[PDB]
Write a protein that binds this ligand. Structure first.
Ligand SMILES: *[C@@H]1O[C@H](CO)[C@@H](O)[C@H](O)[C@H]1NC(C)=O
Length: 234
């Protein structure tokens, strides 16, 4: 995250970091939905995903940190594009559940749709400068803007797609490499999943794309409920 500061240590209990059995590098983040499920971006998938929960500083371990691996991964199968990036969302079922604590808690799903003008918050362990990664997660506030700003910039984001275009039109604040899959929080609810923006991040007139979670509530609830035939919203 660029243009922000270290997040409050208690404001991201649902934030998980994603890496692999091969690299300790945090290539994405995700959001804890309940004791056994994490929501993240589909492009964040890797062969041997590893998930760190309850973490803030990468060098100063929180007492309640937990490490988990997937037992199941679910995607949208009805996508406009074959790589599935127009519906960049994925559910990960943890091999073993986690217990809630101060630093490990579920995020609430959106109870209603929020649009242009809404002030939201982004967070992650992604780059904070051109070539620098933070030791702690950084946070900042951005706004949901007209979807037209993202369309000409991102080929995988068609008009009327289930995504929110958000950031700071003037530039300076934005999600960056390593932040994808993380949650976009608006009024205490997760309204988005970081899909991606431009490189370098924070450029003037270049907001980023966030998968609109509200549209996927039914799919998410169904999947967690045990349904394995339900499909994502058209
Ligand atoms: C999955 O959800 C679909 C759509 O709701 C519906 O047909 C049924 O409720 C579920 N299938 C199963 C096996 O429960």
């Amino acid at each position: 995250v660029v243009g922000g500061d270290e997040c409050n240590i208690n404001e991201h209990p649902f934030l998980v970091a994603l890496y692999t059995s091969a690299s300790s590098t945090i290539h994405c983040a995700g959001a804890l939905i309940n004791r056994e499920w994490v929501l993240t971006a589909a492009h964040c998938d890797r062969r041997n995903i590893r998930i760190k929960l309850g973490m803030h500083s990468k060098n100063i371990r929180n007492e309640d940190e937990q490490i988990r691996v997937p037992r199941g991964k679910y995607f949208c199968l009805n996508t406009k594009f074959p790589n599935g990036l127009d519906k960049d969302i994925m559910l990960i079922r943890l091999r073993r559940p986690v217990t809630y604590s101060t630093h490990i808690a579920p995020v609430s799903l959106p109870s209603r749709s929020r649009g242009v003008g809404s002030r939201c918050r982004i967070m992650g362990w992604g780059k904070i400068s051109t070539t620098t990664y933070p030791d702690v997660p950084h946070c900042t506030n951005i706004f949901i803007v007209k979807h037209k700003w993202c369309e000409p910039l991102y080929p995988w984001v068609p008009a009327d797609s289930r995504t929110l275009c958000a950031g700071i039109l003037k530039g300076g604040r934005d999600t960056c490499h390593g932040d994808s899959g993380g949650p976009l929080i608006c009024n205490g609810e997760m309204h988005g999943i970081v899909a991606g923006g431009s490189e370098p991040c924070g450029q003037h007139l270049k907001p980023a794309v966030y998968t609109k979670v509200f549209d996927y509530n039914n799919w998410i609830q169904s999947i967690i409920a045990g349904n394995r035939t339900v499909t994502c919203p058209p």
